[PDB]
Design a protein around this nucleic acid. Structure first.
Lengths: 32, 200, 131, 122, 180
RNA sequence: GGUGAUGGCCUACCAAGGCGACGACGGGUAGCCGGCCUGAGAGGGUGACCGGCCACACUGGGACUGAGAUACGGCCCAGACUCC
RNA sequence: UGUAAACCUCUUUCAGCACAGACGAAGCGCAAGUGACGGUAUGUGCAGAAGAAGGACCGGCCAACUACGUGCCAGCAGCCGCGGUAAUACGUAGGGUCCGAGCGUUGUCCGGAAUUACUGGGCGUAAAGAGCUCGUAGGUGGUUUGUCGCGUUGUUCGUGAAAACUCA
RNA sequence: ACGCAUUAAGUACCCCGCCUGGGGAGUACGGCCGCAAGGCUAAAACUCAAAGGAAUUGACGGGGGCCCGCACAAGCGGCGGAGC
């Protein structure tokens, strides 16, 4: 169908993975 | 309760003249209000509601009671419409009206409620009394000589009598052969749109 | 794989009746033959032959159409499927098409319509509706 | 799906969202107006819509509309809160009803007096 | 005396260089009130002309409805584009009870007693087409028995034939006051 | 042994089994039903009156008496609360 | 507005005033009486319309429409949304409508919702085929003979308390 | 609807997986796997009255094709600079 539906998920995923790359070491110090 | 307001205007809103004797509607045709002669959107709901209200205000029955009558008709067998009409005609105000003792269902209601009648010996102050097969509706001893029943016996040739009913005495005793069928009812109304209404 | 030759038979019938075929050959089963007999008696088909194949036996249903190719059948519907077997008591038998149809019922009195089953006071497995 | 899929997993109706949770099953609640104020509605509408943050008896602080022309409400006022959606105000689902022992009726209502706590004058 | 019944009026908009160029669509059912009914969809710049075109299309594509009395022969579920309308016959006096589209087509056909229900695609046009498809799927017992190659008795139920004979009497014997 | 009575109900010993994806063990919620409300029905929701069963009687535990006891308006203990 | 009203006539239900006055009790008592309800219900008479009607709604769903005032304010609204000086959507008047000693609102449940679809849905693009296979449990099972009669079906018995629901 | 159309998206049967408005979010918490990256399972609050699918008519395109116009190109004369 349309690619807007792809683009919404795209932006969500992009921002989430940026957040993870940003909090990688914090998340490690907390989890591990 | 009951509707003690003007009578002609309901008939005017509903087109059919239930009693008659006015010139406003009868020269200019319109429902009541300043916005008579207005533009109408011709909805089936208005049709149905108008037949229901025709019945309600032709008789003296209110909606919370007419609903019960409808439900009785729908439960009990046969056609719901003619069962409902049979019920509405098999009540004391209506039988004495149809017998011509009052020439108005309002007047018949006042008479029964004031106790100018009785049924099989026992006094009845209930217009909603559902009469039955083989019912003698006597008038009491004060009432037969009172003026309204004098007027009844005097002018008991104006409107016809149903078949299921007959008056038998100069004292205006009334007898019920059976309960009326849709041919016996003789009312200016259908009966299908009302059941459609309450099936909505 | 194949899981109900009854539905296979009804489908061969339905598809051939849609395509206006005059014959329907299919494998044989005593149950399918009895069903075909019911359809013949109720007038939904012209005839049915039981013949021999290379290996076993075949049913050849000679279907029926009017003069203007009016389909003698308007529908077939398996009901007691594998996975969901439906059984009818003699009281709550189904009226197919308001009664103008025919429900095939398997009972210990044999294979017989809903009408016959209500007559005989019995019920059983509802195989098909064949209006 | 298949019948066996159903007997295994079954049908689960979508969970209806509990609404007016601040009432906690009640039709109304009593609450102190913690902050009476005014809010601006959504974009198509514009007005100064009267509201109050009320701390109910359910231990919940909610926003509540104040229908009618006038209102005498200050903080610390005992108020009776019903339900009712106000579309233009996004974050509000409750209304205040007159005859709350503080919220007197609206002045000079004469058509729909029951909905605004107005007594008949005769 | 053809009874006519509009169910829906809709302002449709073509778009052009200048702007929105409007027109009107009228869905008009018409019938004889006794079993013949037709549907029309009139498209025209003005509402009355649209209705007139709908009337003409309906009277062109009339079709006859099987009945046993003032109801239908058997239940039937008609499907359209996406309109799904079940029809179920009903005992007399219960009244045609249906949404305005199915209701209109049935009241124009003369079906005063019937159960009907739209199960998909609330759009009135496809609903009407679905209802019509149902009425076309209907099968009178006479033509059914012909289709089978049997009597009417052993294909149709005694209740249907009882009501059939009753309606036939109330038609013919009660047409005396009309014929004389 | 115990019970009115069968039974790990309890005990000594013996054997090592038993339950679990067909959801054990846990967590949450809840008295159950006839019925009630809705609904075309299937179903959904509910468990007010009325009627039946259960459970409880400040909390927890315990027995005694007795044909019969969760013994509300009985007993013992402990605890909280109130009072002399 | 509005046969509405005024005015003529009638009627007295109900309420009020006076008198009587229970059934409930083949009961209890072998004592002479015994009814809490109760001097109640109810019957008799008495006077006169005499003491007795509000509430919601009127843009569509949803019958029922105008005027005035306010014009993105005040406000309304369940959704669509209405108010940006000519508002049938706000407020008030009239008028109409729906009910009627009720009327509306809120809350809760079902319906409508075939919107968890057994009856009764679907999955190419609308949400929906696991990335594909193997295979366990499970589900399912070609033709045919016989048997069991578990399912199934028929019949009968018992039970399915009463009340409820339904029919009379 | 586009389209599928004996390689079905048809007619039917069996079995499995999956959906139940859009966002939030295939995210958090928990757990499992993994060296890690991250994956798998998988919400809620809150929020919107839509999100969406196909197709139609137009408009538009730093899409295409064909054709026009002092539109460009080829020329002539100017304005913009001075004064009025």
């Amino acid at each position: 169908g349309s690619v807007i539906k792809k683009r919404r998920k795209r932006m969500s995923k992009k921002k989430h993975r940026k957040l993870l790359r940003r909090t990688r070491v914090q998340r490690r110090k907390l989890g591990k | 309760a009951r509707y003690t307001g003007p009578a002609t205007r309901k008939s005017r809103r509903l087109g059919v003249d239930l009693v008659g004797g006015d010139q406003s509607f009868e020269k200019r045709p319109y429902p009541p209000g300043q916005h008579g002669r207005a533009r109408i959107k011709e909805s089936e709901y208005r049709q149905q509601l108008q037949e229901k209200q025709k019945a309600r205000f032709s008789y003296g029955v209110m909606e919370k009671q007419f609903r019960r009558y409808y439900e009785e008709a729908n439960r009990q067998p046969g056609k719901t419409g003619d069962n409902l009409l049979r019920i509405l005609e098999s009540r004391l105000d209506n039988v004495v009206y149809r017998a011509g003792l009052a020439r108005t269902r309002r007047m018949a209601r006042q008479l029964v409620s004031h106790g100018h009648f009785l049924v099989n010996g026992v006094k009845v102050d209930i217009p909603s009394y559902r009469v039955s097969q083989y019912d003698i509706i006597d008038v009491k001893e004060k009432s037969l000589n009172t003026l309204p029943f004098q007027i009844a016996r005097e002018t008991a040739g104006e409107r016809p009598i149903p078949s299921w009913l007959q008056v038998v005495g100069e004292r205006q005793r009334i007898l019920v052969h059976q309960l009326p069928e849709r041919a016996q009812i003789d009312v200016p109304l259908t009966e299908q749109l009302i059941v459609e209404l309450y099936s909505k | 794989t194949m899981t109900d030759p009854i539905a296979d038979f009804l489908t061969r019938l339905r598809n051939a009746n849609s395509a206006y075929h005059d014959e329907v050959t299919l494998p044989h089963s005593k149950l399918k033959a009895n069903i075909a007999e019911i359809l013949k008696r109720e007038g939904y088909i012209s005839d049915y032959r039981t013949e021999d194949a290379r290996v076993g036996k075949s049913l050849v249903v000679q279907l029926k159409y009017g003069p203007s190719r009016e389909r003698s059948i308007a529908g077939l519907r398996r009901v007691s499927k594998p996975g969901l077997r439906v059984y009818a008591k003699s009281t709550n038998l189904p009226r197919v098409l308001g009664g103008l149809g025919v429900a095939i019922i398997s009972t210990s009195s044999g294979l017989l319509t809903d009408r016959q089953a209500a007559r005989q006071g019995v019920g059983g497995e509802v195989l098909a509706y064949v209006w | 799906p298949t019948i066996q899929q159903l007997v295994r997993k079954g049908r689960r109706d979508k969970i209806a969202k509990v609404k007016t949770a601040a009432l906690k099953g009640s039709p109304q609640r009593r609450g102190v107006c913690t902050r009476v104020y005014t809010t601006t509605p959504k974009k198509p509408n514009s007005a100064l819509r009267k509201v109050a943050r009320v701390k109910l008896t359910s231990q919940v602080e909610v926003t509540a509309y104040i229908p009618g022309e006038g209102h005498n409400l200050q903080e610390h006022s005992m108020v009776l809160v019903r339900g009712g959606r106000v579309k233009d105000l996004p974050g509000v689902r409750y209304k205040i009803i007159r005859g709350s022992l503080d919220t007197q009726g609206v002045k000079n209502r004469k058509q729909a007096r029951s909905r605004y706590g107005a007594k008949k004058e005769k | 005396n053809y009874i006519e019944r509009v169910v829906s009026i809709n302002r449709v908009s073509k778009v052009v260089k200048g702007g929105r160029r409007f027109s009107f669509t009228a869905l008009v059912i018409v019938g004889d009130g006794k079993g013949m009914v037709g549907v029309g969809y009139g498209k025209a710049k003005e509402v009355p002309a649209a209705i007139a075109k709908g009337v003409e299309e309906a009277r062109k594509n009339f079709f006859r409805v099987p009945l046993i009395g003032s109801t239908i022969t058997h239940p039937v579920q008609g499907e359209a584009a996406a309109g799904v309308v079940m029809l179920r016959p009903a005992s007399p006096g219960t009244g045609v009870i249906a949404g305005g589209a199915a209701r209109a087509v049935l009241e124009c056909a003369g079906v005063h007693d019937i159960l009907a229900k739209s199960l998909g695609s609330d759009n009135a046009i496809n609903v009407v087409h679905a209802t019509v498809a149902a009425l076309k799927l209907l099968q009178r017992p006479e033509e059914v028995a012909a289709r089978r190659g049997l009597p009417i008795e052993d294909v149709a139920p005694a209740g249907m034939l009882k009501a059939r004979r009753e309606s036939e009497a109330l038609a013919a014997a009660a047409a005396r006051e009309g014929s004389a």
